Amino acid sequence: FQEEKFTHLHFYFHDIVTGPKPSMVFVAEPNGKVENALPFGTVVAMDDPLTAGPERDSKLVGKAQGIYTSISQEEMGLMMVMTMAFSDGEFNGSTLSILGRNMIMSETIREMAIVGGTGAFRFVRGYAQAKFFSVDFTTGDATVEYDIFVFHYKG
Amino acid sequence: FQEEKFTHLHFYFHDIVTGPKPSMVFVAEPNGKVENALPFGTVVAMDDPLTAGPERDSKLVGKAQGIYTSISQEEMGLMMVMTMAFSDGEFNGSTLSILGRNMIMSETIREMAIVGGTGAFRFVRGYAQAKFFSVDFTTGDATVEYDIFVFHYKG
Amino acid sequence: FQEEKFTHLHFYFHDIVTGPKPSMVFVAEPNGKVENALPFGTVVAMDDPLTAGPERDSKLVGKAQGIYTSISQEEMGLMMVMTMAFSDGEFNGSTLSILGRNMIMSETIREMAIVGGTGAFRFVRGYAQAKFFSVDFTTGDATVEYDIFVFHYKG
């Protein structure tokens, strides 16, 4: 391929459901609630911290902001529609966009396309691989390890 | 163009509204219901079978999973935000992403960009053409013929 | 880069909240209403005119159709999930897709990736820059200047 730059991004995504300041909010629950899962059709909006380490209080490097939707009638699976926006590193203000299926119950390493980027990631080509560091299905709290491989151009 | 592989995909998308196990669910209906249409602002989540033939019981080849939104005040038109995920063929586990307008009342052949892909379709370039095989606007039941033309790389 | 065509698009986006025929509708308001802002998790569907000039009654060149979501807990910021569809110009029926963060309170020039296109914009590569012409946060009425730079191919 012809891109001028390659970058490996590695960080941890936190969906914080419990506690006094959750990172998300239910947008729609057309099938109500069920224990340990999000019923088909549930939509959640997220403002989720991205950190350098698995720990919530490790260095904040960005936010994953968007919505996820429960899109499977047979198991819990999510559609992620979101940006990853970076704020304390080598591409402050730059973003990556994701529109990807996320089969959190049946795939251990989950691939999502990078469908766009801005700033340093204008015209980006790339992909993301997500895997759990920790998940509690009774509450929804999750810490998700991301590796993103992006090919892009001079800023 | 420079891609190493080309694939023509051809299948049928089923939005099943009637019957004992619909494939979709209303997420939001801010303008209620109207006969034979989805009012502006309506959002539906889908877990829609993709089959090799027009018949519902023909070979299941994947699922179209995501949301569609009624986005026109003047006619019924949809925005599709979804993945197509393939499960019984040459690219099991691979997906394609669509973020496209879908003017089901005023275009007979409807083009939607492939905005991303995974697995076999990592780094994909392509487009989809959709046209009705059958539609019942009084219920919403629809069978939609898809041709997708994708350019991609070795797995 | 290798594209055969380049096009500079310039137009004005109107989100019309006040008046007898708003261009949008609230889809979900999980955190209710607040003065001068859209609370985190709010989703709006839009059928927004695109015009050649800042004036609402200047030449209609297309529609921006999709949803925007309030995705920040700390300031008002939007995720745009939408198509721009053109109707009275050099690419009638063609569309561009956007999946981008839109930090309307903290960035004066806001970049969004073009994540796909159709028709004349099949296989497009490009980006959008948005900046206010006018905004009234007490009502939500906004006129937004867009420049879009797209690289594409013969039709």
Author numbering:
A (entry chain A), B (entry chain A), C (entry chain A): 36 to 190
Quote from the publication.
Described herein are the 3D structures of two stereoselective pterocarpan-forming DPs from pea and licorice, which preferentially produce either (+)- or (–)-medicarpin, depending on the substrate. We describe that pterocarpan synthases, containing dirigent-like domains, initially engender mono-QM formation from their chiral substrates, this being followed by intramolecular cyclization (C–O bond formation) to afford entry into the pterocarpan natural product (phytoalexin) class. GePTS1 and PsPTS1, in solution, exist mainly as trimers (∼68.0 kDa), with (because of association/aggregation) a small amount of higher-molecular weight entities also being evident (roughly corresponding to 410–500 kDa). The entrance to the putative active site of the GePTS1 and PsPTS1 monomers is located at the end of the barrel opposite the N and C termini.
The P. sativum “Cam_eor” Unigene set was searched using GePTS1 as query, which resulted in a gene (PsCam039127) being selected as possibly encoding a medicarpin-forming DP. Trivially named PsPTS1, it has ∼92%/85% sequence similarity/identity to GePTS1 at the amino acid level. In our hands, PsPTS1 displayed much lower (∼7-fold) catalytic turnover (kcat/Km) relative to GePTS1, this in part being due to the ∼6-fold increase in Km. The pea medicarpin-forming DP, PsPTS1, structure was solved by single-wavelength anomalous diffraction methods using the signal from intrinsic sulfur atoms (sulfur-SAD (single anomalous diffraction)) in the 11 methionine residues (excluding the N-terminal methionine). Its structure was refined against 1.5 Å resolution native data to a final Rfree of 0.1907. It consists of a single monomer in the asymmetric unit, residues Phe35–Tyr187, plus two residues at the C terminus (Lys188 and Gly189) from the linker for the C-terminal His tag. The extended N terminus observed in some of the GePTS1 monomers is not resolved in the PsPTS1 structure. A trimeric complex is formed by the crystallographic 3-fold axis parallel to the body diagonal of the cubic unit cell, this being in agreement with the GPC. PsPTS1 also has an eight-stranded β-barrel structure, comprised of two curved β-sheets with the same topology as GePTS1 (sheet I: β1′, β2, β3, β4, β5, and β6′; sheet II: β6, β7, β8, and β1). The PsPTS1 and GePTS1 monomer structures are thus very similar, with RMSDs between 0.47 and 0.75 Å for the superposition of the PsPTS1 monomer on the six independent GePTS1 monomers.
